[PDB]
């Protein structure tokens, strides 16, 4: 159970093809208008990770 929770929390630190994993970094170095399509893939990757974990 601890390993599953740690692996799930480690999924948040994953890059998922992006430059970084921190939300403040991606929302600060990138512009608030051109980063929507780039953050969409990260948000759906995290959502599908949640779906796989709950399954």
């Amino acid at each position: 159970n601890a390993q599953a929770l740690n692996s799930l929390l480690q999924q948040l630190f994953n890059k998922f093809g992006a430059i970084s994993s921190s939300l403040q970094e991606i929302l600060s170095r990138l512009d608030a208008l051109e980063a929507q399509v780039q953050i969409d893939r990260l948000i759906n990757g995290r959502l599908t990770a949640l779906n796989a974990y709950v399954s």
Partner: protein, 55 residues
């Protein structure tokens, strides 16, 4: 060399203020951004160049 060079002033806002506990004060030091409460713990065993510590 107007608006081009290496050495110049750096009077912008930097995260170097009077830090204190009892509240998760925002920290943006050493290229790391996060949210957490600071706690005064004595640590003298650090190296001359060591600044942080990881888990």
């Amino acid at each position: 060399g107007i608006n081009s060079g290496t050495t110049c002033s750096n009077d912008l806002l930097q995260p170097n203020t009077e830090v204190f506990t009892d509240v998760c004060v925002d920290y943006d030091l050493y290229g790391i951004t996060g949210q957490g409460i600071f706690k005064e713990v004595s640590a003298v065993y650090y190296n001359s160049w060591q600044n942080l510590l990881y888990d």
